């Protein structure tokens, strides 16, 4: 409800200055040395190393990642009111024309142009990062199948996760629209189906032992989230997706739909989180890789710490699905 | 080892089965709707009882496809008939063969409008409703149906029925899947769909009854759901079996279940839900299937359809083997 910061619809004319502030922060982070954890690519690699896909940690990990990166964009933009505008793809089933302007477009020549240059710039920092990992961080890497930083590079190079200049997205300014399947995935009918569940797991995707495992998926993850990623193409179709600035507009919308669901559950007098014995299993999952606006590792390193918007202190301009 | 063989619909040896299928469709469109093997009576089994978004997905569909295969076998007069499968991984488009004659639900042999559909099916479906057992009425209540008119409300208002010219969105000239659906049927997605080593992760989430929604496995959420929706018209809603291609689609889904089961057996891992989950899954009532004699079937729990069993078919191997 009452909050200091406001995540606006990116089509809101009042959001236009925040998109300029975002451009300023991207330009800064592309120009930070990759020894700085707020370097644009260092930021993307948090997602490669730690993001949950296909499990009940999906919305809560993304709340933490987006909430920390918002503070970093706020700091480096010099815009003390900054909050991430959301992409309401239900209203706008296309890459926003605004995200083809300047450094919101990852084809912009300010971005690293090739895998060769990316590895040249990021290999020494990522090796130094690996060598600094705690016992607990190396266990998370083992859970994810990474025995060394070169396992991370194998997945980047071979997937591929990095896309060269001209291929940073499949969708273009001239042809920005979703295909029929992705239009149905973001449709108001699908959004209502996504919000309909009355238990956290059915809403938020399946229970697993650790957040690097795959389980069954909820509608929110499997339809609008996954199909928007894949339809955009390029970085957005794989685990270096936060290289594309539109990633945070996408996740601002996902987090808004979580906020909608939570308030709907509260209205029905139903639980807002996993219940009984599931709650501590879900809350105690280690999230060990988030970076604050000072470039330092964050203290709050359990999933449970990110269950509520809490100290991130934002709310949303209401968007698609609010009336549920 | 099996008596019947579900072939790839691109196999030259499947071409006679596509003609037999056309003959059975023509017959079932011309059966009175008092006959439970009438084409529309058959589609309504799916509207009344199909699970979507839970662990009963593959097993209910095995039962429905297996019974309807026997009905097509009987009414075609082809004693070797088995449903050819649509390997959309190999053929990411509506097969050109499914735009020929009554394989195309735009064919004028089909009922052309909702008004005629209701006129033909309302009295039979009302008589059917009034014949339901306490147990069948409980399944209807689980699904939110207190009356046959709740079923018609869902048909009319969704809508589930599509008029002549709109029976599919994809056409003979433009039969191809969009980029998202091509990815959903891609070999990479098929391998991901087969990768799970537990039934629930493979076959979608546990629920208390089969009319409830849960989390979904890759098999259901990507290739199954996206092919339905990309085709459009009948295939995007719960009168989907009105489109003959429904059974070619479900022959491929059932093949991928067979592939998964044999992969599990090779790894020495479970082929079904385990422990306390197994009886919950096996004992779910499936009370609406119709035999090739037009009679209600005796095998009326999910557990009866866990194996191919006396349906007695195997597959020509396809994508993901
Ligand atoms: Cu992610
Ligand atoms: Cu994402
Ligand atoms: Cu179905
Ligand atoms: Cu289906």
Author numbering:
A (entry chain A): 34 to 357
B (entry chain B): 35 to 355
Provide excerpts from the study:
Tyrosinases (EC.1.14.18.1) are bifunctional metalloenzymes catalyzing two sequential enzymatic reactions: hydroxylation of monophenols to o-diphenols (monophenolase activity) and oxidation of o-diphenols to the corresponding o-quinones (diphenolase or catecholase activity). It does not require a caddie protein for copper ion incorporation, which makes it similar to eukaryotic tyrosinases. To gain an understanding of the catalytic machinery and regulation of vsTyr activity, we determined the structure of the catalytically active “core domain” of vsTyr by X-ray crystallography.
Crystals of the vsTyr core domain belong to the space group C2 containing two monomers per asymmetric unit. Despite reconstitution with CuSO4 after its purification, the initial crystal structure, determined by molecular replacement at 1.43 Å resolution, revealed that the copper sites were only partially occupied. Using the anomalous contribution of the Cu ions, occupancies of the CuA and CuB sites for the two copies of vsTyr per asymmetric unit could be estimated to be ~40% and ~80%, respectively. The lower occupancy observed for the A site may be caused by its proximity to His86, which belongs to a flexible loop. Interestingly, the increased metal site occupancy is the only noticeable difference between the two vsTyr core domain structures reported here. Their superposition results in a very low RMSD of 0.4 Å and identical crystal packing, hinting at the remarkable structural stability of the vsTyr core domain. The final models contain all amino acids of the crystallized construct, except for the C-terminal two (unsoaked) and three amino acids (soaked) in chains B, respectively.
